[PDB]
Design a protein around this nucleic acid. Structure first.
Ligand SMILES: [Mg+2]
Ligand SMILES: [Mg+2]
Ligand SMILES: [Mg+2]
Ligand SMILES: [Mg+2]
Ligand SMILES: [Mg+2]
Ligand SMILES: [Mg+2]
Ligand SMILES: [Mg+2]
Ligand SMILES: [Mg+2]
Ligand SMILES: [Mg+2]
Ligand SMILES: [Mg+2]
Lengths: 56, 53, 53, 52, 187, 128, 125, 147
RNA sequence: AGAGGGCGUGAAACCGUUAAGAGGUAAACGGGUGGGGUCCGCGCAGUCCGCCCGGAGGAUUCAACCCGGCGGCGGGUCCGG
RNA sequence: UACCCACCCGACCCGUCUUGAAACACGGACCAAGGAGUCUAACACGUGCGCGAGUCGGGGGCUCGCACGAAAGCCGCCGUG
RNA sequence: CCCCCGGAGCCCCGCGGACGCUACGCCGCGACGAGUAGGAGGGCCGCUGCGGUGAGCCUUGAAGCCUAGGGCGCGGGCCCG
């Protein structure tokens, strides 16, 4: 606790983080989430197919 | 004075250093690439008559 | 074990005499400069006199 | 010495063998045997995308 | 302001043959090509072996090559050794084999051909089966070098038998304090 | 108006000043050539404040404009005439520099053979 | 084989010149002097060369014959072309291509032809 | 060569690879293998077990030629002979059992290691092993002694 | 003889004088500029060139096409050897 | 960028032993040239190359007055070891 | 019928392949970059000498030395006037 600062985020806070500062770990790389064929290419086996499905 | 001046090679090693030495005496690319001005020589494994002896 | 062509003997004055030998199988041996170089350096050391103080 | 015969002037010696025969690989690499069994290339060099 | 140990982030494996022999550098140029392209992990092992040292791709005796080809099913395939095939004087019934290797000692070369066999090199193997189809990869025993005997715990630690370096073995060379229970102790 | 380059980029140089050796000013026995100080209590090697700068790699020139003259061409130390026709093709990218110890007679012959096939020479009006 | 020689000649050649952070090859009838594999004169068995004519005007086109190599006296045929810098170019063009004779040099041969002619005309003001 | 020596790369390095706390003084441990009992014991006892002390029985003026005795295993017996004398057998329908003079190939003893081909033999040696007896006998063949 | 009898070359420390600039916190130094110099690149417009095209001027011979010859390339009938 | 000068900010003298050096710790006026991990033998492991249950290498021998040679080549010597 | 790239006219072209391909070359992504003692790697960093090689350079001026002369390299140093 003396090192962190945590709390309960609201929806707009989830969007802002995921869009503006959201990078996906693909092949152990920080690759920017520019198009959602990069999200489906990693998470498609879970019904997650788009930038919006990530946020669910 | 007793620095190990002289060196050694296996017998077959220094025999097979002669094969590759000879096999490259053909192949004008390798020969000319040593700057041996072979541009008019009729053939590279140049054999001459035994009058020359 | 490659194919070996027919090397022509030249007369003492240029042009090609009828005699025609063969390429002796040495000239198909593997080129290996890594071995020519190595064997050369370890042999050229031998013709050399001790310098000392 | 030749290949399939002794030296007959040196005691026991024959030419060295080859680590490989067809020392050219430009012909090996475009023979139909090799060409047929190849994954198709990937040459759409992907300049990195600026994140807007 | 990141907190990873960079201790062992650089991976120490050979990515090119440390040797200069143009021939090995040439069929490395061949499987630097096949390895990237064809789905066969076969050449990815063949390539990753053409890098290794003499001390690490040991010779394969001819008899150890028989009993690994005599096993039920691997008939008709080709033995593939990134190394040399030596001879085995203590074996006589030489079945017909199809072998590939970098080198084959001259004596073992005549035992194989006389038995109606065939030996290839790693470039004809590329034309036989570029995917490595119908092959058997083998090697000599890498824990075969006499060096591997001096390795281990220690000589003189409890019941850990490891050969010690001695200038010459004999009666009076290291059978004393530590070896016979009568003279000091023993381990 | 001689021999424009193929591409004349914007050449930027992260540091333009030399890297003199520590204390190369107080003493004459010390040249300006860089030597990496290795003192225990030395104040440059522990990169203190307001001290002379230690050269390191992230200090180095752009990969495109590296070794590039202010005109655009890389130098080639041409030594005689036959070593000029090497540049016959790689000419709009880099140019010819005649060696110091070339005699004044053929130092001319190198010049006008270059002006024949358009190889800019950086020291073309030199000996005379 | 070509790939064999290139491993003996990559370094260690009497035509290789390495200075001033470049490398170069002064060997005969290689286009643009590149110490290369494609652009090499001896290593190969079909080579195209382009050098000025000895007269001062024209362009001579070296083609290796490949009929028999290790015959350097005749293995290696030349020809002359003294024409109008547009047919001149279209001669080496039709000679390399639609002959399937090393269509790697195809463009590098032309850019060497053109740069030869630019070197034989009124020099300067 | 001097060219590829770490002593080149140690120029401008003050201590020259030997550390400035404890310098490279001349002889810190001792000279040679000195102190096996004292202060080097952990080495001699954990890496050279059995170094220190007498054992066994003195035999003054030993000579090796007295007790010279090389060995063959049955593993490689048909190697001493040209392999054609083996092929001129397993055939010939007479029980030829060619003679192998292990003395002529320089071995005063035959030991019983390894398989033996199903083939009659006569092995002339000096000293036999018991199992080397049974391996030759059981294959069909004789063990003949030579002085 | 800017090789003069311990005389080839003739460095640095150090000193002499000429030139230029400075000068109460010993000097020296790192970063950043500014001012002045010695020169260096220029220009007595540096408007840099290179295609292709269009237009207007002026000049020599062809390319396109066939015909004679030479020389290659590749090809297959592996046809003949 | 480098010569001189100016300014604002920064800035203690290096080498060394040291828990700690700008130290009221020691070496150091300045400048030139010289100047310190070498060779031999013996192990050990790693690596490259030849050959591979073998493989040598020495001493000898056979071939030169060496120009290059006191080299290279060869020898049931090659296994006496 | 739905035909041939010696021509579909080409954002895909598997019929032939870059300028690019020094294949120990070139290229695209990411991540990361304190350092004594010490280790390792790379040094078209430097000094002297030999076997090669540069149809190298040189009395139309080599080595060395000197330079407020133009520059290149992160730098070792280097090239020019
Ligand atoms: Mg250090
Ligand atoms: Mg010390
Ligand atoms: Mg004088
Ligand atoms: Mg004087
Ligand atoms: Mg004054
Ligand atoms: Mg104290
Ligand atoms: Mg005090
Ligand atoms: Mg003291
Ligand atoms: Mg670091
Ligand atoms: Mg000198």
């Amino acid at each position: 606790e003396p090192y962190i600062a945590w709390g309960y985020p609201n929806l707009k806070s989830v969007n802002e983080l995921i869009y503006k500062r959201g990078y996906g770990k693909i092949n152990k790389k920080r690759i920017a989430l520019t198009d959602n064929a990069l999200i489906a290419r990693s998470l498609g086996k879970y019904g997650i197919i788009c930038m919006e499905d990530l946020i669910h | 004075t007793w620095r190990r001046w002289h060196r050694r090679v296996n017998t077959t090693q220094k025999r097979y250093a002669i094969c590759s030495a000879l096999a490259a005496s053909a192949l004008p690319a390798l020969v000319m690439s040593k700057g041996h001005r072979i541009e008019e020589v009729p053939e590279l494994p140049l054999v001459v008559e035994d009058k020359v002896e | 074990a490659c194919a070996r062509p027919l090397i022509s003997v030249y007369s003492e004055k240029g042009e090609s005499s009828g005699k025609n030998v063969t390429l002796p199988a040495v000239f198909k041996a593997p080129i290996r400069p890594d071995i020519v170089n190595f064997v050369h350096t370890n042999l050229r050391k031998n013709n050399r006199q001790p310098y000392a103080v | 010495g030749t290949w399939r015969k002794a030296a007959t002037l040196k005691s026991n010696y024959n030419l060295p063998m080859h680590k490989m025969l067809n020392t050219d690989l430009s012909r090996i690499l475009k023979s139909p045997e090799i060409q047929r069994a190849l994954r198709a290339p990937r040459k759409k060099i992907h300049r990195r995308v600026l994140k807007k | 302001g990141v907190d990873i140990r960079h201790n062992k982030d650089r991976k120490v494996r050979r990515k090119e043959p440390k040797s200069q022999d143009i021939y090995l550098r040439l069929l490395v140029k061949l499987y630097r090509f096949l390895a990237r392209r064809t789905n066969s992990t076969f050449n990815q092992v063949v390539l990753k072996r053409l890098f290794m040292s003499r001390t690490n791709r040991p010779p394969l005796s001819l008899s150890r090559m028989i009993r690994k080809m005599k096993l039920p099913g691997r008939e008709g395939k080709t033995a593939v050794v990134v190394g040399t095939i030596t001879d085995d004087v203590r074996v006589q019934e030489v079945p017909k084999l199809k072998v590939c290797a970098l080198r084959v000692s001259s004596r073992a070369r005549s035992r194989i051909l006389k038995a109606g066999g065939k030996i290839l090199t790693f470039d004809q193997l590329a034309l036989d089966s570029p995917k490595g189809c119908g092959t058997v990869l083998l090697s000599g025993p890498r824990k075969g070098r006499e060096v591997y005997r001096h390795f281990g715990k220690a000589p003189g630690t409890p019941h850990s038998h490891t050969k010690p370096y001695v200038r010459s073995k004999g009666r009076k060379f290291e059978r004393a304090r530590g070896r016979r229970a009568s003279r000091g102790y023993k381990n | 108006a001689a021999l424009r380059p193929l591409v004349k980029p914007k050449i930027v140089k992260k540091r333009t000043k030399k890297f003199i050796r520590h204390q190369s000013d107080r003493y004459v026995k010390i040249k300006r050539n860089w030597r990496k100080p290795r003192g225990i209590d030395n104040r440059v090697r522990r990169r203190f404040k307001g001290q002379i700068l230690m050269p390191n790699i992230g200090y180095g020139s752009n990969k495109k404009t590296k070794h590039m003259l202010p005109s655009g061409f890389r130098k080639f130390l041409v030594h005689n005439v036959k070593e000029l026709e090497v540049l016959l093709m790689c000419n709009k990218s880099y140019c010819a520099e005649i060696a110091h110890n070339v005699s004044s007679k053929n130092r001319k012959a190198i010049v006008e053979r270059a002006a024949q096939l358009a190889i800019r020479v950086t020291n073309p009006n030199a000996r005379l | 084989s070509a790939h064999l020689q290139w491993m003996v000649v990559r370094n260690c050649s009497s035509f290789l010149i390495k200075r001033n952070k470049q490398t170069y090859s002064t060997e005969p009838n290689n286009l643009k002097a590149r110490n290369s594999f494609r652009y090499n004169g001896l290593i190969h068995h079909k080579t195209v060369g382009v050098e000025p004519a000895a007269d001062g005007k024209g362009v001579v086109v070296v083609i290796k014959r490949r009929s028999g190599q290790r015959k350097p006296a005749t293995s290696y045929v030349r020809t002359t072309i003294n024409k109008n810098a547009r047919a001149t170019l279209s001669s080496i063009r039709h000679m390399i291509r639609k002959n399937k004779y090393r269509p790697d040099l195809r463009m590098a041969a032309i850019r060497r032809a053109s740069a030869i002619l630019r070197s034989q005309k009124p020099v300067m003001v | 060569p001097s060219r590829l020596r770490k002593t080149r790369k140690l120029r401008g390095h003050v201590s020259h690879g030997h550390g400035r706390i404890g310098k490279h003084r001349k002889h810190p441990g001792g000279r040679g293998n000195a102190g096996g009992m004292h202060h080097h014991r952990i080495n001699f006892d954990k890496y050279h077990p059995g170094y220190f002390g007498k054992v066994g029985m003195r035999h003054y003026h030993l000579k090796r030629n007295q007790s010279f005795c090389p060995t063959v295993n049955l593993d490689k017996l048909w190697t001493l002979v040209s392999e054609q004398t083996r092929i001129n057998a397993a055939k010939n329908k007479t029980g030829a059992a060619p003679i192998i003079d292990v003395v002529r190939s320089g071995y005063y003893k035959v030991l019983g290691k390894g398989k033996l081909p199903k083939q009659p033999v006569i092995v002339k040696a000096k000293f036999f092993s018991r199992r080397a007896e049974e391996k030759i006998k059981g294959v069909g063949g004789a063990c003949v002694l030579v002085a």
